[PDB]
Assembly symmetry: D2
Homo-oligomer: 365 residues x 4
C-alpha cells in the first residue's frame, strides 16, 4: 500500500535507487496559496540542519511541482512533485552486499518478494522521508488556513531527557533539542556514538495547537470507531522506520495512575490537564495534541556483526563509512510532517459531520 | 469509518443502545470450518474481568450467524452476525443523562455531531468489543489453517509488573495474570481500587506465534510503506478506548539502547534475539510478534467525579453501582482479537506478493 | 466487496437464505430527520406494486433501524437496519438443486468459492435489492435537504418504447410505464411472456433533478479522474443483477452524431440542450442527470433448458412455477435507489473541493 | 480520486500543463519480466495506426521507469514512471482562452474548483491516456503470466458498422478497423468529417480471452456484490473522456430479447453461446469477455459555437486548426489498457477466495 490518508491522499513512487523520487498529494482544496518558502525550509530541516551549510542549490534535493498548482495557488487537482538527487560516485560502505544487515529490512524484503535487489543510497528510508516532508508542507499550508500548527523537537537522546521545552530553541538547534540545559549532554552522547562507531536511540515530541493563544483546536476531529484520531496518528508514526513505540499524552505513564489521580475534567471550553494528549474517546477534545515517538538506535554501525547471506551461510557484516548516529533527530521532523498530514485529512473528513455544513455550502451558494 | 481491514473487512453497526448489535466479516476464504466452541469460548473470555472470578456466569450474549456459513463451513461470502444481550430492568448504577461524564467522549461527540444522545449500557465500547471478539474468532479460525495462534495476558496492574510470562496460567487467572508470583499483589491492587471506588491502569501483552513448536511465522507479512504490519497493529490497538500507548518488541525501551545492543543478530536458522518484536522494516521477520498495550485507569468510578454537562453548566456525577476497576483486563482479550484480525488481513494480502503465487493458483490447478 | 460508496458507505450482510437480512449505512450527516413514511413507501414500491394491494404492514418486509437514529434524527453514526422476509409457509418453484440454471450465477459461484449451497427463495437479488432500496431512502432524505430528487420509470419492454415521459403516471402504473400511449402494448408483451412461460427484457430511465422548478443541480459533483460521477453511476447500475448496458444522456446514440449535432451549447442561464445527460468531464453540469439501464430478460423461465450438473453431465433444467416475467420493472426502482446513493456520496465528497468551504465551516461556524 | 483499482492500484499525477506527466502502479507481484518491447509498442498504438510514421525514440512517448524494477524484473514494490514531451517551436491554434468550450470539461472544473486552467496541449486527454496505456502494459505482462490477453478494435465509425471482426487486421489498420470490408467506408466518414471541420462518434469493441490450452478464462473473477467484474469494467470505461455508454455481451440488444432467446445454455463441452459477454452473476464465466464502448464525437471542432466565458458573458468559441476527427479510434486502445488493469486487479483479489489457496502457498512452502 503506497498511499497514506483517506480524503487528503499521499501516494509515493516507493523505494528506489534512481536519481529521482516522486509523490503526489491528492485531495488539497483549491485556492490555497503555495508557500514556497515553507516547502524549501521543511526540506532543509529534514537534513538535520546543523551549524555550517552551503546553498542547497548545488548541494542537495530540490522539489519540483509538476501539477496541482496554477499561479501559486492549489487548483484542487492532484499535486505531483519530484525530487532529484545523487551526485559524485561513492566508495562502497559495504563489502559483498548479499547479506542481511542486522535491524535492516533486507531480510523481510528478500523473503516477501524473493528478488535480490538492495543497493546503497541510505537504503529503504531517507528517500521516503523527503516525500513525506514535502507532502507535509502542503498539509501545513492547509492547516494554517484554519489556524492550526504542528511542531516537534527532541526530548531525549540516549536516555538524556529534557525537563523544559522550547520549540523555538529546537528550531535552531543542531539536534532539535527542546531543552537547552540538556542539549550539551545530549550532543556529547552523540559524539561518543560516532567515536565508538555506534548509534543511540531517541524520543521525539510532536505537538499540534491553535495559532491563537489559548485558542482550542477543532473539537471532534476523528472518524467513527475505526478511523479514530489517536489510532491514525499511531498508524502513521509506528509506520516510520525505526519507530518501536508511540504514546499519546500521558502515554505509558497512564498505566501507572489511578482514576482519582488521572481522570480529566472540564468546564465550558477545553480541558485543563492535558493527560489525554488532546484526544478523548478517539476524537480531538480541543486541547493540544501531544505525541511521543520512540526510535530504536540507527541500524547501520561500523562494527562487525554476525549474520547470514542470501544463501544462508554465516558471515560477517562490517559496514564501513560514516552513519547516522541517531535517526530520531531527522525522524522528529518526519513525524511532524505526518501529524500534519493526518490532521489535515481529519479536518477534511470532518466537513461531512453535520447536515448544517452541507446546507451552508450548497443552499447558501 | 465503521470498517476495519483491507481484504478481511470487519464492519460494525456502530454504537447502539438497543437489544441487538450487528457486524459483518467480509473476506473469509471459503472452506474454513466454523469452530463454534472457539467462538463461544472467546465470548466467554470477553466477560472475564468483572464479577466473574473462578465460576464466571454465562447467561449472556448469544451470537447468531445470519450468513456466510453453510454446513458449518464458510461459503466465501460475507459472514453477518447479530449479538443478542442485555436483561433485567435498569435501576441505578448511573446518574443524570444530560451530562458528559468526566473524561468521556460524550463531550467530543456533541461538538462533532451536536445531538443530545447517549444513555447507559457502559456508554458503548463494551458493545463494540463484543463485535471485535466475535469477528476475532473467525480470524483465528483462518490463522489456524496455516498454523498461527494469538495469545494475551496481563503483564502489569497498578505498576506491579510481571517478571515471567505464562500464557497458559493467564488463561485460568481471574485477572489473566501472566506471572503467578505477582498475581496476588496485582489482585490486591484491584481489590483496593474496588474498595475505594477507584480504578487503576494496566498493561496487556499480546503475541502471535507459529502453532508448530519450534516453527517460525510467515516472513513478509505487512504491505508496502503505508500498510506496514506494526503500523496496522498500532492503529487497531490505539483505537481501543482507554489505550494511550502501544509498544512493539523492545518498545519504549528501544530508545535507551545502543545499536550494538539493540541489533538482532542471526545464526544458522533464525535471529539470536527479538528486540524487533517479530516486525522488521514493517514486515514480519518470522519471530514472535510482541505487542504491549497501555490502558489508563477507567474514567467512570463509583467515586464522585466532575467535568461538564451538555450546556457547559453544572451537574452531579455520583454514579451509583460499581464500575470497572481495570479495563486492561478485558481489554487484553479484545487486543488479542484485534491482532488476529490484523494478522489474518495481512495473511490474505501477502498472497499477491510473488508471481509464482499466482501461477501456482491459476496454472498449477 | 460488500461495501458500496466512498464516504456514504453501505455495507451488506451479503447473500443468505435466512429470515433476516441486514445492512448498515455510514456517513450520514447528523441532524437529518428520518422520514419513516418515505422509507415505508420505498419498500412498497420495490415490490413492483401492481394492480390492487393491501396495507404493507403485516404484508411483507419491515425495516428495523437498530442504530444511528435518536428521536427521529440521524446521529451521525452508522445506521444499521434489519429486514425480515418470508415466514408463513411457502410453495415450490424449483427442480434439481444440483444443476447450473442458465443465465444464473450458479456456475460462477460454484467455481469461485466451490461450496455448493444453492436453494430457492429468490436465491439472491430480492434480498439485496431490499437493502439497497432501504439505504436509498436515507440517501434520498439527505438529497432532499439540498433540494435534489431522484425518479425513475420504464421506457421499454420487449422493444416497445416510450415516446413521452410522465414520471407521475409511472408511479401509479402496474409496470411503472412512463408513456401511457405505449403502456398497453408494453403490458401485452408482459402478458404474452407469462402465457408462454417466458420472460422479456426491458429498459429503465432514471433521472435526478432539482425539486425547485428549473433550478440547477449542484455543479461539480464527481471526484477526480477515477471517481467520476458517470463512472460511479455506471458501476452501481451495471452491478445490478440483470443489467447488460448503461447509458448517460444521449448514450449509444451519441456515437451516431457529428460534433456539431452533439455539442451542448451554452448561454448565461446554462446549457441549451442536454445530450451530455447532466455529466460533463465526469462531473455534474447542473442539468438533469439522465441514465438508461438495460435489463436482460428474467433468467428463470418455466421451460426445459439444456445445461449441466455439478458433475459435468448434461441434464434438463425445468424451473416449475411462476417467475418474474420482466425484472426491469422492479429493477427500475433499485436503479433509482442506487442513483440516490451515488449522488449523496458525491454531495459529501464535494465538500472538500474549495478552501472557502473549510473556512466557512471552521473559521465561522 | 486519482487512484484506479483495489489492489493493483494506479495513481496518477493528475492533469498538468508541464512537459512531464507521471504515475505509479502499485501491487504488481514480484518476478514479472518487464517487456520493454510491449511497453514501447503500446505507447505507439495509443497515437493511432497511420500507415506512414516516424521511428520511435523521438517526437513523443518514451516511458522512464523510476522504481519497482530491478534487472528487468518487477520487484514487488511500486512501479513509478514518468513520461516526457514538448520541445521548442510549434504551430498555433489559440484565441481567447478564457471561455467554456462546448462538450469539454472546462465548465465543470471551473465550477467545482473555481480556478481557470484549461490551457492548450489538447487540454489533457492524451496526457492521462498515456499514463493508462503505460500502466496497462504492465497489467498485460501480469495477465500473460496466466494466459490472459486483452484485444480491441473499432466496430463503428460515424454509423458505419462492421459485420465481421478480425482483431489481427485491426492491429495493422490505420483506424483499427475490425472489418476490412467496411474500413474504406469508415475512413470516408472520417474524411468527410475533416473536410467539414466536424467530428464523428464511434464504437470500440474490447475483448479478453485465454491463450491457455483449455481456451477458457479463469472462472470467478469479480468480487462480492459491490466489486463485480462487469461493474468495474463499466466504471473504468465510462470514466474515460468521451464515453457515453458501455455494454457487456449482448448489451443493449439484451433488452429486446425473450428469456428463451437470451439464456446461454450449456452441454458437456461448456456454454453453447455467450450473450452474457463472459460475465455471469458479476463474475467471469470462462467465456470471452465482450465489451462495447460508445464514444461521442470529438468535442473540439473548427466551427463557430455559442457559449459563455468564465464570467457569464456570452461569446463565440471558434477552435482553429485541425482536431482529432474521431476520438473513438485512440480511445479503443485506452479501453483495452483499462480492461487489462481491471482484469489484473481482479486476478489478484480472487487469490483469497478459497482456503485451499492459502494452504498451498503457506503450508506447501
Ligand atoms: C464501566 C466501564 C467499562 C468499560 N469497558 C471497556 C472495555 O471493555 N475495553 C476498553 O478498552 N475500554 C473500556 N471502557 C472505556 C470507555 O470505552 C471509554 O474509553 C471511557 O469511558 C472514556 O475515557 P477515554 O475516552 O479517555 O478512554 C470502559 C469504561 C467504563 C467506565
Ligand atoms: C544510515 C541510516 C539512515 C537512516 N535514515 C532514516 C531516516 O532518515 N528516518 C527514519 O525514520 N529512519 C531512518 N533509518 C532507519 C531504517 O530505515 C530502519 O531502522 C530499518 O530499515 C528497519 O527498521 P525496523 O525493522 O524497526 O522497521 C536509517 C537507518 C540507517 C542505518
Ligand atoms: C425469478 C427472478 C427474479 C429476479 N429478481 C430480480 C430483481 O428483483 N432485481 C434484479 O436486478 N435482478 C433480478 N433477477 C436477476 C438475477 O439476480 C440475475 O440475472 C442472476 O443471478 C445473474 O445474472 P446477471 O449476470 O445478469 O447478474 C431475478 C432473476 C430471476 C430469475
Ligand atoms: C482534440 C481532442 C482530442 C482528444 N483526445 C482524446 C483521446 O486521445 N482519448 C480519449 O479517450 N478522449 C479524447 N478526447 C475526449 C475529451 O477528453 C472529452 O470528450 C471532453 O473534453 C470532456 O467531456 P466528457 O469527459 O464528458 O466526454 C479528446 C477530445 C478532443 C477535443
Amino acid at each position: 500500500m503506497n498511499t497514506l490518508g483517506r480524503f487528503l491522499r499521499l501516494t509515493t513512487f516507493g523505494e528506489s535507487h534512481g536519481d529521482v523520487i516522486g509523490g503526489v498529494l491528492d485531495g488539497m482544496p483549491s485556492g490555497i496559496k503555495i508557500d514556497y518558502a515553507l516547502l524549501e525550509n521543511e526540506m532543509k530541516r529534514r537534513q538535520g540542519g546543523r551549524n555550517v551549510f552551503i546553498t542547497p542549490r548545488k548541494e542537495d534535493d530540490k522539489v519540483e511541482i509538476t501539477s496541482g498548482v496554477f499561479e501559486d495557488f492549489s487548483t484542487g487537482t492532484p499535486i505531483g512533485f519530484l525530487i532529484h538527487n545523487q551526485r559524485a560516485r561513492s566508495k562502497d560502505y559495504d563489502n559483498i552486499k548479499n547479506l542481511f544487515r542486522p535491524s535492516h529490512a533486507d531480510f523481510t524484503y528478500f523473503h516477501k518478494y524473493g528478488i535480490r535487489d538492495f543497493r546503497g543510497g541510505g537504503r529503504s528510508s531517507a528517500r521516503e522521508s523527503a516525500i513525506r516532508v514535502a507532502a507535509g508542507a502542503f498539509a501545513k499550508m492547509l492547516l494554517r488556513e484554519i489556524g492550526i500548527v504542528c511542531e516537534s523537537g527532541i526530548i531525549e537522546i540516549g536516555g538524556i531527557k529534557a525537563k523544559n521545552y522550547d520549540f523555538n530553541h529546537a528550531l535552531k538547534s543542531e539536534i532539535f533539542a527542546l531543552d537547552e540545559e540538556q542539549e550539551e549532554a545530549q550532543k556529547t552522547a552523540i559524539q561518543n556514538a560516532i567515536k565508538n562507531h555506534d548509534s543511540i536511540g531517541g524520543v521525539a515530541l510532536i505537538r499540534a495547537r491553535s495559532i491563537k493563544t489559548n485558542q482550542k483546536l477543532p473539537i471532534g476531529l476523528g472518524q467513527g470507531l475505526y478511523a479514530k484520531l489517536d489510532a491514525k496518528i499511531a498508524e502513521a508514526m509506528m509506520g516510520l522506520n525505526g519507530v518501536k513505540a508511540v504514546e499519546i499524552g500521558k502515554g505509558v505513564e497512564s498505566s501507572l495512575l489511578k482514576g482519582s489521580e488521572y481522570n480529566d475534567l472540564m468546564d465550558q471550553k477545553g480541558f485543563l490537564s492535558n493527560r489525554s494528549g488532546g484526544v478523548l474517546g478517539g476524537m480531538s477534545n480541543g486541547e493540544e495534541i501531544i505525541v511521543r515517538v520512540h526510535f530504536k538506535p540507527t541500524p547501520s554501525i561500523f562494527q562487525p556483526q554476525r549474520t547470514i547471506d542470501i544463501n544462508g551461510n554465516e558471515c560477517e557484516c562490517l559496514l564501513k563509512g560514516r552513519h547516522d548516529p541517531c535517526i530520531a533527530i531527522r525522524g522528529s521532523v518526519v513525524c511532524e510532517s505526518l501529524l500534519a498530514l493526518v490532521l489535515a485529512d481529519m479536518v477534511l473528513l470532518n466537513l461531512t459531520s453535520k447536515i448544517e455544513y452541507l446546507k451552508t455550502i450548497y443552499n447558501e451558494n
